Amino acid sequence: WDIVKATQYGIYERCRELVEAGYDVRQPDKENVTLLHWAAINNRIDLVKYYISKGAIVDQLGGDLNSTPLHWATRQGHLSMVVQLMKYGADPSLIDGEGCSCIHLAAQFGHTSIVAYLIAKGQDVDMMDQNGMTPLMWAAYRTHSVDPTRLLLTFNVSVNLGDKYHKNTALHWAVLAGNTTVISLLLEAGANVDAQNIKGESALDLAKQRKNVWMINHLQEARQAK
Amino acid sequence: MTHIDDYSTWDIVKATQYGIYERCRELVEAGYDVRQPDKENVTLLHWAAINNRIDLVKYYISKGAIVDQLGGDLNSTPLHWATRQGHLSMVVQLMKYGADPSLIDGEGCSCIHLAAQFGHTSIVAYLIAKGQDVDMMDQNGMTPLMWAAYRTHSVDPTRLLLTFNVSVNLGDKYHKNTALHWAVLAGNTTVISLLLEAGANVDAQNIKGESALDLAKQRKNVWMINHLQEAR
Amino acid sequence: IDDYSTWDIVKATQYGIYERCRELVEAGYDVRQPDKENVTLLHWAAINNRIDLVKYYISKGAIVDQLGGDLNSTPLHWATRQGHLSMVVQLMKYGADPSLIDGEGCSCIHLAAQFGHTSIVAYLIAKGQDVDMMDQNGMTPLMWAAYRTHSVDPTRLLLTFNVSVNLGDKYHKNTALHWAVLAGNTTVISLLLEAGANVDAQNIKGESALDLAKQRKNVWMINHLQE
Amino acid sequence: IDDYSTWDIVKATQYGIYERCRELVEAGYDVRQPDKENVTLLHWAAINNRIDLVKYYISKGAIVDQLGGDLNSTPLHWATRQGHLSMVVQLMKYGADPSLIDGEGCSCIHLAAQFGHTSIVAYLIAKGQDVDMMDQNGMTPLMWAAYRTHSVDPTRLLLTFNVSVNLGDKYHKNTALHWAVLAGNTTVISLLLEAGANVDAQNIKGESALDLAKQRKNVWMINHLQE
Amino acid sequence: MTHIDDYSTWDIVKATQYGIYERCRELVEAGYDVRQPDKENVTLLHWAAINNRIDLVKYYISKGAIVDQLGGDLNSTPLHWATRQGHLSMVVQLMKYGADPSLIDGEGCSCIHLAAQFGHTSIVAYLIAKGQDVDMMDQNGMTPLMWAAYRTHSVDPTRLLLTFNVSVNLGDKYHKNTALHWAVLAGNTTVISLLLEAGANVDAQNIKGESALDLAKQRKNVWMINHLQEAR
Amino acid sequence: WDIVKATQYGIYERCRELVEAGYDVRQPDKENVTLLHWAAINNRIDLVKYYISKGAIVDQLGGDLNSTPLHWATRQGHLSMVVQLMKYGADPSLIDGEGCSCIHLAAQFGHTSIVAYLIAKGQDVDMMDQNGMTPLMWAAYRTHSVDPTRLLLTFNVSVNLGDKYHKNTALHWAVLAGNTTVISLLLEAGANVDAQNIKGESALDLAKQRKNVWMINHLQEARQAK
C-alpha cells in the first residue's frame, strides 16, 4: 500500500521500506495530516519511535482541526501512545482547533486512565480550555458514569468554578445533560446548588426546568446540608 | 444520603463495606475503635478501601486508622487490597495520605506487581508515573513484566510495560526465567508474541540451562515451538 | 434518575417522589401496610424529611405512633434520631407523642440528646418534656449527652435549663461526670465542673469519678477534676 | 494570639477571653458602661455566643434588655440575628423578652424569620410567640421568610404551625405570595401555593400577585401560579 | 468570624473592602445586585480583589459577578487591580476562574506590564509560567523589560526578566526606544548596569537617530555617559 | 582567588580564566560541593549558564546533605536561579539529604514566590516529602505569616492530610508551633479540629494543652460551624 495506509494498518516493514526509499516523514497528506498523526491515532508504538528518529516533528499541528499527534492519541484513548509521545517530549498542554488540551479531550471522552496519567505528570486539574471549560465540566457534561468525575474529585479539583462564557459550574452542566450519576458525586464534594450562571439560573433552577423530582430533591437537600 | 434501609441494626463492618457513612460515623461516635480489626485481622480501612469507599477511608484515617496497617490472611495493606481489586481512585487517595506502594504483602509482592498480575493497566501506569521502578523485582524475584507474562493472557499490561523502559531479558532472581520463559510456562501465546517483537532473547537460559525454546519443546506446543523458532 | 416513575411505593417514599406515592396509594396501596422489615411508609417519610408525604399519609389513615423496625420505634423516634426538627414539629402537630419509648427504653429527648441534636432538645423541653426525665435505663438527657456528645452542646444547653448535675442513673448509678470521663469527653467535663459537679461522688461500683480519671490516666482530666 | 491577656474588656469579651473579662470587671470596669458605639458588653457577648460571659455579666448587674447599637436593639435581638439558639434560650431564661422591638419595628420572631433561623423560629413559637404576630411594619413571620429566605424553611415550618397564608401587611398590603414573587423565591412560591395561597389576591396597589409574576416575566412563576 | 464591630450599619462596599463576609452575604441575600457598580463604575469584585478578599471574590462570582468586568477611572478588570496592588494569591484565584491576564486596561497595559512597572517580581514569574509572552508588547509599544527599565529603579524585576528569554534590543513600536533608552531617560542607573551586562546595543538608534549614548550626553549625566561609553 | 571563592563572589572573568586554564567544572571540593552549587546558592546566573556549557552536571548531588544545586538555590530563596536551573532541566522533585524536595524547602523557608512558580510548573501541591510532610504542613509549622499558607490554600491543597509518621495535620502543626496566623486560615479552609494524630490527640486537645484560650475558642467554634 501507500505509506499512509501502511502506517494506519501498522505494516512496519513496508513503512521502513518506503522511508528508506526516500519518502520524507514530514510530508503531510491532502488534509495536512502527517505520518506521525496516523501512527499515533492507530497506536503504532514502533512506528512512532521510527518516524521520530527519522525527523518527524512530534507536536506538528495537522488535520482539519489543527491537532498534534498526542491530541489524536488522547481522543482515541491510547494510554500507551500517550506515554510514548510524552516520552519524546510531546506537550499535552498544547491547544487543538477546538480549543482543547489533552486533559480536556481525555475527560470528555471518558478516558479515565489517561486523565490519571496526565495529572500524575503535572497537568493542571483545573485547567480551562479555550472554550472556558475545565476537565470536570467536560466530564459532567459528556460522561454519564462514575469516572472520570470520581477520579477528578479525588485529585481535589475546584468544584465550583463556572465556565468562562456561560458561568455554568460542573453541576449546571450535569443537570443540563441529565447526568444523574455525576450529580450525586458533585453534591457530595460540595457543589454549590445556588451558584448562578450568566442567565441567572442556579443548578436548582435548571433541575426544576427539567422537571426531574429526583434532581430537585437532591439539590434542595444539598443546600440544607450546606 | 437517602435512607433506603434500616441501618440502626447494621454492624460497623457491614456499614463500611456498603459505604453507609452516617451509620459508621455513628458507631465510631458511640465509641468503636477504628483500629480494632475483625476476626480475620482485617481493619475497617481495608474494608473501605477494597469496597472503594473513598469518603469512609478519609473519615477513618482522621479518626486514627493506621494507613499502611498490615492485615488479613495475606498480611497486606489497605493499598494492596485496593490495588488487587483495581480501584484506581482509591489507590490515588490512599497514596495522597502517604500509603507506600513499595511495601510487600504476605506473598512477596508490592503494588506494581499486584497491578501487573491482575492486569490493572491504568494503575500500573499511575504507579510508574508516581516513581515506582518499572523493573522493580519483588521478593519472589519477579518483575512486573514477568508477572504480566505469567498471568495476563492479553495485550495489556504487557504492551504498556514494554512501552516504558523495561528490561525484557532480566531473569528472576531464583530460577533465572525471563518474561519469555514465564510466558511459555503459562502457555500465554499472546504475550510471547509481544515479547519476541520486543527483542526477548530466545536462547536465554535459566539456571537449568533451559532456554525459552527448550521449554516450548518439552511442552510439545507446536504453536510456541515454531513461533520462537522463527523468532530466533 | 433511571425513571423513578416506575419505582415501588417504598422507594418512591424514601426518595420523596410525591406524585408517584400519591398515584400508588390512590391505586390501592394501603399506607398502613408494613414492609418486609416491618417498617411503615410513615417511618421512611419521617427519616427522609418528607414533610409533604407525612401529611398525606396521615390523612390516609397512617398510624402516627405506629411502632416499627428492629428497634420498635415510631416515625417520630426516627425523625428525632436523624435530627430533622421540622419533621419532629410536624409529627407532634399530628399527635405524635415524644414521651414514648423505643426498643431501647429511650424517649425522644434522650435520642435527641445522645445524637447531639440541640435544636430538638430545646424544642422538646419547651413543649413540656422534663429536662431531668429518665429513660427505662435511668439515664437522663444530661448523662447521654455527656456520654455521647463531644461538644459544648447539647450539654451547655441542658445546663441552661437548670438540670440537676449530680443525679445518677439506676443500674450503674453513674453521674453525668462519670460518663463524661468514660467517654473521654473533656469538653463536657469542663462544662460540668463549672456547673458544680461532684468530683468525689462515687458510683454504685465505688468509683469516685476522679478514680476513673486515674484509671484512665488522662493527664488533662486528673488535673482539672483535682483542681 | 499576640497576648490577649492585655486586651481591653470589649475585645476580651468579643473573643471570649473569660478570665481577662472577669479580671477587668473585678478591678472596677462597670458591665453596664456602653462603648463609643453605645453597645454594652452583653451585646458583644450575646452575638459572639459567649454563654459564660452572659451569665457572669448579668450576675454583675448588666441590664438584660438594654437597647444599644445604631439599630437600638437588645442583646437578644443580636443573638437572634446571628442564629445562636442556645444564647436565645439562655437570655430568655434571664428575663429577656423576645417580643420587644428594635429600631426597625421587628421582634425576635421576625428577625429569626428574615434571617432563616428555623430552630429559633420553632423555639419562640413553642414559648408563646404568635405565629401570625405582626411587627410595626405589619409584616408577619411568613411574609419575611417568603421575602428573605430562598429555602423550604422557615416557610415550611411556619406553614406547619398553621399560619394564615392570605394575610397582608399594613402599608403595602402584600401577601406572603406577593413578597415571594418580588424576591424571585420559587422555592417559597411552591410551598405557599400548595398551602392554598390566593393567586388572584390584589395588593394595596392593585397588583394581583400573578400580575407581578407577569411584570417579572418569570416563566416558571407565571406557569405555576396560573396552574 | 469574631464580631468586633457593629456591621448592621455597614454598606456593601465598605463591608467588601474590609472583607466582612457575613455582612456582604446578608446584603446580597437582602437583594443587592453584585453586578451593580458604584459611582466610579467600580464593581464589588474590583473592591474584593484589590483588598485581597479571596473568599468574597469566590462568593461574588457564584452570585453572578462578571469576572473580567471593566471598571473604574482606568477602565480595568478586577485582575488588573489585583496585579497593580501586587496580590499574588488573588491573581492566582482570579485566573483560576478564567480571568484573562492578556486583557488591556485603559492605559494600554496587560497584567504582565502592570506587574513589571510596579515591580511585582513574583507575579511576573507566575504569569510567564502560566504562558504569558515575556516579550509581549502592550498597546503603548512597551515590553515588560522596557517598563521595568523605565519605572523600577531596582535589580528586580529586570534581572528576572533577563533570566527568561527576553529580547534585550527590541525598540518600542512608536519611538523605537530600547529598554536601554528608557533606562537612560529615567536615570535608572541600576537597570542600565543590568542591560549592558545583558548585551544591550549601546549604538541602537530610535526613530530620531538617537542612541542610548546620545541621550546620556544630552542629559549631561557623567555617570551614564561613561558607563555606556565603556560598555560599547 | 581560587575558583571556588571566585564563584561564590561572582567574579565571572576570573572563573572563566581558571576554567579555560584547565580546571574541571565537575571537580568537587572537600565537602563534595561542586562549582554549580556555589554558583546557584549565590545567584550567579551567568556562571551557571557557563559551567553547564562546560559540562557541569545540573542535578549533581553534593554537600553534607547530598543536595542538588536547585535545592541550594531554593533554600536561599533565589527565584531567578530556580527559573534558570529548571530551564536547564533541573528536577525540583528530587530529594535532598533531609528528605525534602524543592517545594518543601520553599514552604518551610517562606519563599512564597518560589512556591507559586513550582506549582505553576507542575509540582504536586500535596507532595509528601520523605519525612511524611506536605508543603502545607511545613508552612504551618515554620512560617508565622499569612503566606505561603494562604497561597497554598488557594491552589486547593488537601487541608486534612496527616503526616505519614505522626498523623499531625497542618492544623496540629500550627497549634504545636503556636502559629495563630495560620490557624485562622486553616480553619476557614475547613481544617478538621477533631482529627486525631498517632497519640490520639486532636488539634483541640493540643490547644487546651497549650492553654491558649484564643485557640481553644476558635477551634471549638470551627467545630460548631462544621
Q: Domains, chain C, ranges and CATH?
A: 1-227 (1.25.40.20)
Residues 6+ apart with CB under 8 A from C42: C31, C54, C57, C58, C62, C63, C64, C66, C75
H helix intervals, A21-88: 35-41, 45-53, 69-76, 79-87
Q: Looking at the complex, report in whole angstroms how far the Cα of residue D123 sits from the nearest Cα belonging to chain E.
A: 23
The Cα–Cα gap between F164 and F130 comes to 9
Instruction: Calculate the CA D49 to chain-centre distance.
Output: 16
DSSP bridge partners of D175: D168
Cell numbers linked to E125: 514569574
Residues 6+ apart with CB under 8 A from E21: E55, E56, E59
Q: Assess contact for C78 and C46: CB atoms under 8 A.
A: yes
Q: Assess contact for D44 and D15: CB atoms under 8 A.
A: no
**Cβ of A179: how many Cβ atoms within 10 Å?**
24
Cell numbers linked to B218: 518439552
The Cα–Cα gap between A86 and D141 comes to 64
Helix B179-186 to helix B222-231 angle (10° resolution) is 160
The Cα–Cα gap between D55 and D59 comes to 6
DSSP bridge partners of A162: A169
D and B adjacent (3 or more CB pairs under 8 angstroms): no
H helix intervals, chain F: 3-8, 12-20, 35-41, 45-53, 69-76, 79-87, 102-108, 112-120, 135-142, 149-154, 170-176, 180-188, 203-210, 213-225
Q: Pick from F196, F208, F217, F226 the residue to mutate for testing the C interface (most C CBs within 10 Å).
A: F208
User: By CB neighbour count within 10 A (0-12 exposed, 13-18 middle, 19+ buried), where does F31 fall?
Assistant: exposed
C-alpha angle D121/D194/D166, rounded to 5°? Answer: 65
Residue B129's closest CA among E125, F168, A83? A83
Query: End-to-end distance of chain B based on CA atoms, in angstroms?
Result: 62
Considering only CB atoms, which chain F residues are within 8 Å of E130?
120
Region for residue F10 given its phi and psi (left: phi exceeds 0; alpha: psi -120 to 50; beta: otherwise): left
Cell numbers linked to C63: 398510624
Closest-CA residue of B relative to C77 is B8
Strand locations in chain B, DSSP E?
Answer: none
**Cβ of B23: how many Cβ atoms within 10 Å?**
21
Residue E223's closest CA among E196, E174, E197, E184? E184
Cell numbers linked to A146: 462514575
Q: Looking at the complex, report in whole angstroms how far the Cα of residue A66 sits from the nearest Cα belonging to chain E.
A: 20
The Cα–Cα gap between F154 and F157 comes to 8
CA-to-CA separations, A103 to A94, A154, B130, E230, in angstroms, rounded = 10, 16, 18, 53
CA-to-CA separations, E114 to E85, E108, E194, F57, in angstroms, rounded = 9, 10, 21, 37
The Cα–Cα gap between E47 and D182 comes to 28
Residues 6+ apart with CB under 8 A from B214: B205
The Cα–Cα gap between C35 and E5 comes to 56
Cell numbers linked to C10: 417504598
Q: Assess contact for E212 and E184: CB atoms under 8 A.
A: yes
Residue C226's closest CA among C179, C175, C176, C189? C189
C-alpha angle F91/F95/F99, rounded to 5°? Answer: 155
The Cα–Cα gap between B171 and B180 comes to 9
HEC profile of chain D: CCCHHHCCHHHHHHCCCHHHHHHHHHCCCCCCCCCCCCCCHHHHHHHCCCHHHHHHHHHCCCCCCCCECCCCECHHHHHHHHCCHHHHHHHHCCCCCCCCCCCCCCCHHHHHHHCCCHHHHHHHHHHCCCCCCCCCCCCCHHHHHHHHCCCCCCHHHHHHCCCCCCCECCCCCCEHHHHHHHCCCHHHHHHHHHCCCCCCCCCCCCCCCHHHHHHHCCHHHHHHHHC
Q: Looking at the complex, report in whole angstroms how far the Cα of residue C152 sits from the nearest Cα belonging to chain F.
A: 8
Contact flag F161-B98 (C-beta cutoff 8 Å): yes
The Cα–Cα gap between D212 and D170 comes to 19
HEC profile of chain C: CCCHHHCCHHHHHHCCCHHHHHHHHHCCCCCCCCCCCCCCHHHHHHHCCCHHHHHHHHHCCCCCCCCECCCCECHHHHHHHHCCHHHHHHHHCCCCCCCCCCCCCCCHHHHHHHCCCHHHHHHHHHHCCCCCCCCCCCCCHHHHHHHHCCCCCCHHHHHHCCCCCCCECCCCCCEHHHHHHHCCCHHHHHHHHHCCCCCCCCCCCCCCCHHHHHHHCCHHHHHHHHC
C-alpha angle A174/A176/A177, rounded to 5°? Answer: 65
Closest-CA residue of D relative to F184 is D1
Q: Pick from D157, D187, D223 the residue to mutate for testing the A interface (most A CBs within 10 Å).
A: D187
For B53, which DSSP code? -
Considering only CB atoms, which chain E residues are within 8 Å of A126?
96
Q: Looking at the complex, report in whole angstroms how far the Cα of residue A75 sits from the nearest Cα belonging to chain D.
A: 40
The Cα–Cα gap between A224 and A218 comes to 10
Query: End-to-end distance of chain D based on CA atoms, in angstroms?
Result: 60
Instruction: Calculate the CA D27 to chain-centre distance.
Output: 36
Residues of F with a Cβ under 8 Å from any B Cβ are 126, 128, 132, 158, 160-164, 167, 192, 194-196, 198, 200
In the block, cell 504542613 appears at F137
Contact flag C86-D123 (C-beta cutoff 8 Å): no
The Cα–Cα gap between C175 and C194 comes to 15
For B7, which DSSP code? G
Q: Assess contact for B35 and B65: CB atoms under 8 A.
A: yes
Contact flag E1-F112 (C-beta cutoff 8 Å): no
Q: Looking at the complex, report in whole angstroms how far the Cα of residue F202 sits from the nearest Cα belonging to chain D.
A: 20
Residue A66's closest CA among A30, A98, A29, A106? A98
Q: Which long-range contacts (CB under 8 A, 24 or more apart) does F20-23 make?
A: none
F and E adjacent (3 or more CB pairs under 8 angstroms): yes
Task: Look at the alpha carbons of D103, D106, D109, D115 in this order and tell me if their dihedral is positive or negative.
Answer: negative
Identity of the residue in A122, A123, A158 whose CB atom sits nearest the CB atom of F156: A158
Q: Assess contact for A160 and A123: CB atoms under 8 A.
A: no
DSSP sequence for E69-129: --BTTTTB-HHHHHHHHT-HHHHHHHHHTT--TT---TTS--HHHHHHHTT-HHHHHHHHH
Residues 6+ apart with CB under 8 A from E198: E162, E168
Contact flag B98-F192 (C-beta cutoff 8 Å): no
For F137, which DSSP code? H
Contact flag C187-F224 (C-beta cutoff 8 Å): no
Cell numbers linked to D18: 473569660
In the block, cell 472520570 appears at A148
Q: Assess contact for F145 and F181: CB atoms under 8 A.
A: yes
Contact flag C123-D118 (C-beta cutoff 8 Å): no
In the block, cell 453521674 appears at C175
Region for residue E111 given its phi and psi (left: phi exceeds 0; alpha: psi -120 to 50; beta: otherwise): alpha
**Cβ of F20: how many Cβ atoms within 10 Å?**
9
The Cα–Cα gap between B12 and B17 comes to 9
Cell numbers linked to D13: 469579651
Q: Assess contact for B4 and C37: CB atoms under 8 A.
A: no
Considering only CB atoms, which chain C residues are within 8 Å of D153?
86
Identity of the residue in F132, F164, F192 whose CB atom sits nearest the CB atom of B62: F192
The Cα–Cα gap between C145 and C160 comes to 14
Q: Assess contact for C9 and C15: CB atoms under 8 A.
A: no
Q: Looking at the complex, report in whole angstroms how far the Cα of residue C124 sits from the nearest Cα belonging to chain A.
A: 22
Q: Assess contact for E120 and E86: CB atoms under 8 A.
A: yes
Contact flag A214-C15 (C-beta cutoff 8 Å): yes
Q: Assess contact for E212 and E175: CB atoms under 8 A.
A: no
Q: Give the amino acid at D76.
A: L
Q: Assess contact for D67 and D107: CB atoms under 8 A.
A: no
Experimental technique of record = X-ray
Closest-CA residue of C relative to D128 is C126
Identity of the residue in C118, C156, C162 whose CB atom sits nearest the CB atom of D51: C156
Q: Assess contact for B181 and B145: CB atoms under 8 A.
A: no
Q: Assess contact for E165 and E129: CB atoms under 8 A.
A: no
- What does the buried/exposed string (b/e) look like for D1-13 if buried means 16 or more CB atoms within 10 Å of the residue's CB? eeebeebebbbbb
Considering only CB atoms, which chain D residues are within 8 Å of F213?
4, 16-19
Q: Assess contact for C75 and C34: CB atoms under 8 A.
A: no
D154 prior amide bond cis, ω within 30: yes
Cell numbers linked to D197: 395561597
A and D adjacent (3 or more CB pairs under 8 angstroms): yes
Contact flag A214-C17 (C-beta cutoff 8 Å): yes
Q: Give the amino acid at C78.
A: W
DSSP bridge partners of D121: none
H helix intervals, B31-120: 44-50, 54-62, 78-85, 88-96, 111-117
Q: 3-class SS at E6?
A: coil
CA-to-CA separations, E20 to A66, D102, E88, in angstroms, rounded = 48, 23, 21
Residues of E with a Cβ under 8 Å from any A Cβ are 58, 61-64, 67, 96-98
The tally of CA atoms less than 13 A away on the side-chain side of residue F129 is 23
DSSP bridge partners of B205: B211
Contact flag F122-A122 (C-beta cutoff 8 Å): yes
C-alpha angle C57/C63/C68, rounded to 5°? Answer: 105
Task: Look at the alpha carbons of B25, B27, B31, B35 in this order and tell me if their dihedral is positive or negative.
Answer: negative
Q: Which chains touch C (3 or more CB pairs under 8 A)?
A: A, B, D, F
Residues of F with a Cβ under 8 Å from any D Cβ are 180-181, 213-214, 217, 221
Contact flag B64-F162 (C-beta cutoff 8 Å): no
Q: Which long-range contacts (CB under 8 A, 24 or more apart) does D188-195 make?
A: D188/D145, D188/D146, D188/D149, D188/D150, D188/D155, D189/D221, D189/D224, D189/D225, D190/D224, D191/D152, D191/D155, D191/D156, D191/D159, D192/D146, D192/D155, D192/D159, D192/D165, D193/D224, D193/D225, D194/C52, D195/D159, D195/D165
> What resolution (Å)?
2.0
The Cα–Cα gap between B38 and B41 comes to 5
The count of CB pairs under 8 A between chains D and E is: 26
Q: Assess contact for B124 and B154: CB atoms under 8 A.
A: no
Residue E134's closest CA among E113, E154, E153? E113
Q: Assess contact for C151 and C159: CB atoms under 8 A.
A: no
Residues 6+ apart with CB under 8 A from E79: E49, E67, E68, E91, E94, E95, E99, E100, E101, E103, E111
Identity of the residue in B6, B9, B31 whose CB atom sits nearest the CB atom of C183: B31
Q: Assess contact for B114 and B82: CB atoms under 8 A.
A: no
Closest-CA residue of A relative to B130 is A120
The Cα–Cα gap between E70 and C63 comes to 63
Tally: H helices and E strands in chain B: 14, 0
User: By CB neighbour count within 10 A (0-12 exposed, 13-18 middle, 19+ buried), where does A139 fall?
Assistant: buried
Q: Looking at the complex, report in whole angstroms how far the Cα of residue D157 sits from the nearest Cα belonging to chain E.
A: 20
Q: Looking at the complex, report in whole angstroms how far the Cα of residue A172 sits from the nearest Cα belonging to chain E.
A: 12
C and E adjacent (3 or more CB pairs under 8 angstroms): no
Q: Looking at the complex, report in whole angstroms how far the Cα of residue A223 sits from the nearest Cα belonging to chain D.
A: 8
Cell numbers linked to E14: 465598605
Considering only CB atoms, which chain C residues are within 8 Å of B26?
115
**Cβ of F21: how many Cβ atoms within 10 Å?**
8
Closest-CA residue of D relative to E30 is D148
Residue D129's closest CA among D99, D103, D95? D99
Residues 6+ apart with CB under 8 A from B69: B35, B43, B45, B46, B77, B78
Considering only CB atoms, which chain F residues are within 8 Å of B61?
162, 167
- What does the buried/exposed string (b/e) look like for D145-168 if buried means 16 or more CB atoms within 10 Å of the residue's CB? bbbbbbbbbbbbbbbbbebebebb
C-alpha angle D112/D113/D119, rounded to 5°? Answer: 60
CA-to-CA separations, F1 to C158, F18, F24, F25, F42, in angstroms, rounded = 80, 10, 16, 16, 16
Q: 3-class SS at A89?
A: coil
Query: End-to-end distance of chain A based on CA atoms, in angstroms?
Result: 63
User: By CB neighbour count within 10 A (0-12 exposed, 13-18 middle, 19+ buried), where does B230 fall?
Assistant: exposed
User: By CB neighbour count within 10 A (0-12 exposed, 13-18 middle, 19+ buried), where does C27 fall?
Assistant: exposed
Residue B34's closest CA among B24, B23, B21? B24
User: By CB neighbour count within 10 A (0-12 exposed, 13-18 middle, 19+ buried), where does F24 fall?
Assistant: exposed
Q: Looking at the complex, report in whole angstroms how far the Cα of residue D147 sits from the nearest Cα belonging to chain E.
A: 9
- What does the buried/exposed string (b/e) look like for C67-99 if buried means 16 or more CB atoms within 10 Å of the residue's CB? bbbebebbbbbbbbbbbbbbbbbbbbebebebe
In the block, cell 499512509 appears at A4
CA-to-CA separations, A51 to A45, A46, C220, in angstroms, rounded = 10, 9, 71
Contact flag F196-B62 (C-beta cutoff 8 Å): yes
Region for residue A178 given its phi and psi (left: phi exceeds 0; alpha: psi -120 to 50; beta: otherwise): left
